């Protein structure tokens, strides 16, 4: 609910973090379009649809491309530190 | 490599299918933007980045919205039948 | 919703089937007390809280003890064929 | 073997903790009826059949109902702190 | 127990099959040195320590090198058809 | 790349660590023959083929037998502390 950036630490035993990302087309930012039930993201209970990913393990994804967001997530290791900012209006305005 | 629709059956024991989807913004179609290592999609070896999802278990996703694509995948059960069509040019043209 | 026995086939890559069982104390039957999100049971969408397990791979669990129900499930292999019968009244009447 | 409460921290990447719970019918307490091979509970090696769950992440489950025990576990996040007390006699006396 | 080749079909949602392999050094054959609890191999209940892998999805591994055995398993897809032959004497004679 | 021992902490929610081990035949040491995609080992990005396992949670595996290496790994719990030393020459010299 907070519009202030949040730090969320997710742990994974396999590649999946439990969410799907969109954006990164032309510097509009990377957003979480949906959370998968039972996965790390779901279990934490902090990440949601509409969240924008500011960074993943220090790597700045604000003006990142989808390909970069994907690479950052892929190499985040088992403990993934996501800084997300809940901004639905923008998500809608840009994707829905 | 084939541009003809392919039927791909993925099996899952948890919510994840092993890929990330984009599109579904304004009827441009749903595409696989990236495959996750070790997941069902990766293991099958048929699905790839650039693939467009024509349908998931009969449900037509050609002109579906991201929200619908997500719901179809969510309720596909354990055996998910995807009909994908490899069209990179369009993926680029529309997302990259 | 049907009170007639249903055959449900769940597939697992690990020990978990995605549900929790109670009963088997004094021949009252084995019941599913809760479904876990993302697991096989959840994904199938057929099994629910209140369901009574008639059998698991031919093994009759009607008048089974909790210990037997556990052993049947443990050795069901990867393809587990459950015959469940939805009877909430009895579940309540006996456990809640 | 100790009858003194033990703190056990289990980590999960999916909903499952690796054990099955019974009780919570009429304030007799929540007990672990069986451990699943390969799951978090099994891997830790501390939790066993006969253990009574005093609490899960501060939430007191002593006189909890099965429904509450289930909700506590469901929302425990990825790091689940269980305080269990090994009391087989009571488990038998009440369930077996 | 049978010394006659057996066909065993394992299903996986992730890379792991649930067993560890040795051999393939100098054409002595590939053997299963240990089974992991809860994994596909364990769940099937057919594969055991001492088993020699004749083939994996038609690919003949009799005189295969460890590197080839690894590649065959890696690309077996989700349904892996193993033809194993239980020969402990040889396993000992060659590895233990 | 470093030939100096490295401490690598892997986390698992199931029995699998994400790698396959060989050796332990006649005190030549235990080595990682291959890494599985998506598993803990792969995700960490530190362990590789050719690595020799000096210890797993203090348990010295230098002159361990395959059976001991297997037992150490089996009981390492969820947080597994591996001290590996990258020595390919020896791996080749002894296995390939």
Q: What is the dihedral of CA D13, B14, C15, B38, to 10 degrees?
A: -80
> Alpha helices, DSSP H only, in D30-81?
40-44, 66-74
F37 three-state secondary structure: coil
8 Å CB contact between F45 and F18: no
F26 is written with which tokens?
Answer: 């006649």
State the Cα–Cα distance between residues C80 and D39, nearest whole angstrom.
Answer: 18
CA distance C22 to chain D (A): 6
Of B34, B28, B38, nearest to B66 by C-alpha is: B28
Rg (CA), chain B: 12
> Other C-beta atoms within 10 Å of D3: how many?
10
The residue count of chain D comes to 96
F60 three-state secondary structure: strand
Q: Inter-chain contact B67–A20, Cβ cutoff 8 Å? A: no
Sign, CA dihedral F7-F13-F15-F21, equals negative
Of E35, E37, E34, E31, nearest to E85 by C-alpha is: E31
8 Å CB contact between F1 and F86: yes
**A41: alpha, beta or left? (left if phi > 0; alpha if psi -120 to 50):** alpha
Q: Is the CB of residue F15 less than 8 Å away from at least one CB of chain A?
A: no
8 Å CB contact between A86 and A3: yes
> Other C-beta atoms within 10 Å of C35: how many?
23
8 Å CB contact between D84 and D33: no
* C-alpha distance across the termini of chain F, in Å: 19
Q: How many CA atoms lie within 13 A of D10 on its CB side?
A: 30
Sign, CA dihedral F67-F68-F74-F79, equals negative
From residue E94, how far is each of A71, A90, D19, E19, E50 by CA, in Å?
A: 44, 65, 39, 19, 11
> Other C-beta atoms within 10 Å of A39: how many?
24
State the Cα–Cα distance between residues A41 and C75, nearest whole angstrom.
Answer: 32
E6 is written with which tokens?
Answer: 């057996």
Q: Is the CB of residue E46 less than 8 Å away from at least one CB of chain D?
A: no
> Other C-beta atoms within 10 Å of C94: how many?
17
> Alpha helices, DSSP H only, in B4-76?
40-44, 66-74
Q: How, if at all, do strands B51-56 and E79-86 pair?
A: unpaired
State the Cα–Cα distance between residues B94 and B50, nearest whole angstrom.
Answer: 11
The residue count of chain A comes to 96
State the Cα–Cα distance between residues F93 and F49, nearest whole angstrom.
Answer: 14
Interface test with C, best of B9, B75, B78, B79 (most C CBs within 10 A): B78
State the Cα–Cα distance between residues E59 and E75, nearest whole angstrom.
Answer: 11
Q: Inter-chain contact B66–A95, Cβ cutoff 8 Å? A: yes
Residue listed under structure tokens 């590895």: E95
Q: How, if at all, do strands C51-56 and C79-86 pair?
A: antiparallel
As a whole number of angstroms, the longest Cα–Cα distance in chain A is 35
- Contacting chains of F (3 CB pairs or more, <8 Å) are A, B, D, E
> What pairs with residue F8 in β-bridges?
F82
> Other C-beta atoms within 10 Å of C26: how many?
9
Residue listed under structure tokens 């490899």: B86
State the Cα–Cα distance between residues F11 and F18, nearest whole angstrom.
Answer: 10
Q: What are phi and psi of E84, to 5 degrees?
A: -115, 155
State the Cα–Cα distance between residues B63 and B24, nearest whole angstrom.
Answer: 7
Contacts of E14 in chain C (CB under 8 A): 13
Of F58, A30, B59, F68, nearest to E33 by C-alpha is: F68
State the Cα–Cα distance between residues F83 and A45, nearest whole angstrom.
Answer: 34
> What pairs with residue F41 in β-bridges?
none
3-class SS shares of chain C: helix, strand, coil, % to 5: 25, 35, 45
What is the DSSP secondary-structure string of C38-74? TSHHHHH----TTEEEEEETTEE-TT--HHHHHHHHH
Interface test with F, best of B37, B41, B42 (most F CBs within 10 A): B37
CA angle F83/F86/F88 to nearest 5° reads 145
8 Å CB contact between D39 and C14: yes
Q: Is the CB of residue E9 less than 8 Å away from at least one CB of chain F?
A: no
F89 CB contacts (<8 Å, ≥6 apart)? none
Q: Is the CB of residue C75 less than 8 Å away from at least one CB of chain D?
A: no
| Method underlying the structure | X-ray
Q: What is the dihedral of CA C60, C65, C69, C75, to 10 degrees?
A: -90
**B58: alpha, beta or left? (left if phi > 0; alpha if psi -120 to 50):** left
> Other C-beta atoms within 10 Å of A27: how many?
10
Q: Is the CB of residue E4 less than 8 Å away from at least one CB of chain F?
A: no
Of B70, F42, B91, B12, nearest to A21 by C-alpha is: B70
Q: Is the CB of residue C36 less than 8 Å away from at least one CB of chain A?
A: yes
Q: Inter-chain contact C75–E45, Cβ cutoff 8 Å? A: yes
Q: Inter-chain contact F66–E22, Cβ cutoff 8 Å? A: yes
What is the DSSP secondary-structure string of A24-93? -SSSS-EEEEEEPTTSHHHHH----TTEEEEEETTEE-TT--HHHHHHHHHTS-SEEEEEEEE-HHHHHH
8 Å CB contact between D5 and E5: no
State the Cα–Cα distance between residues D47 and D33, nearest whole angstrom.
Answer: 11
From residue C35, how far is each of B31, C38, D71 by CA, in Å?
A: 32, 9, 11
| DSSP designation for B2 | -
The residue count of chain C comes to 96
> What pairs with residue E86 in β-bridges?
E51
State the Cα–Cα distance between residues E13 and B72, nearest whole angstrom.
Answer: 20
Q: Inter-chain contact B36–F37, Cβ cutoff 8 Å? A: no
State the Cα–Cα distance between residues F41 and A90, nearest whole angstrom.
Answer: 38
Of B92, E83, B96, E39, nearest to F74 by C-alpha is: E39
> What pairs with residue A8 in β-bridges?
A82
Q: Which helix (H) or strand (E) is E92 found in, with range? A: helix E88-95
> Other C-beta atoms within 10 Å of B38: how many?
24
> Other C-beta atoms within 10 Å of D9: how many?
13
Closest Cα in chain B to A69? B34
Of F66, F31, F73, nearest to F52 by C-alpha is: F31
* D1-96: CATH number: 2.30.42.10
Q: Inter-chain contact C70–D38, Cβ cutoff 8 Å? A: no
D66 CB contacts (<8 Å, ≥6 apart)? C22, C33, C34, C95, C96, D21, D22, D23, D24, D25, D30
Of D43, D40, D38, nearest to D73 by C-alpha is: D40
D10 is written with which tokens?
Answer: 């289990």
Interface test with A, best of F43, F45, F78, F79 (most A CBs within 10 A): F43
State the Cα–Cα distance between residues A87 and A32, nearest whole angstrom.
Answer: 10
8 Å CB contact between C27 and C38: no
8 Å CB contact between F13 and A10: no
Of A79, E71, B23, A45, nearest to D75 by C-alpha is: A45
Residue listed under structure tokens 């900012």: A85
Q: Is the CB of residue B39 less than 8 Å away from at least one CB of chain F?
A: yes
Residue listed under structure tokens 């970069």: A68
State the Cα–Cα distance between residues B95 and B91, nearest whole angstrom.
Answer: 6
Q: Is the CB of residue C14 less than 8 Å away from at least one CB of chain A?
A: no
Break chain D into its structural domains and give their ranges.
1-96
CA distance F53 to chain D (A): 21
Q: Inter-chain contact E36–D38, Cβ cutoff 8 Å? A: yes
């Amino acid at each position: 609910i907070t519009r202030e950036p949040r730090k969320v630490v997710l742990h994974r035993g396999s590649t999946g973090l439990g969410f799907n990302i969109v954006g990164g087309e032309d510097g509009e930012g990377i957003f979480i379009s949906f959370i998968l039930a039972g996965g790390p993201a779901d279990l934490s209970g902090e990440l949601r649809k509409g969240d924008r990913i500011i960074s993943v393990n220090s790597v700045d994804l604000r003006a990142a491309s989808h390909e970069q967001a994907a690479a950052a997530l892929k190499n985040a290791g088992q403990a993934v530190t996501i800084v997300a900012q809940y901004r639905p209006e923008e998500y809608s305005r840009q994707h829905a």
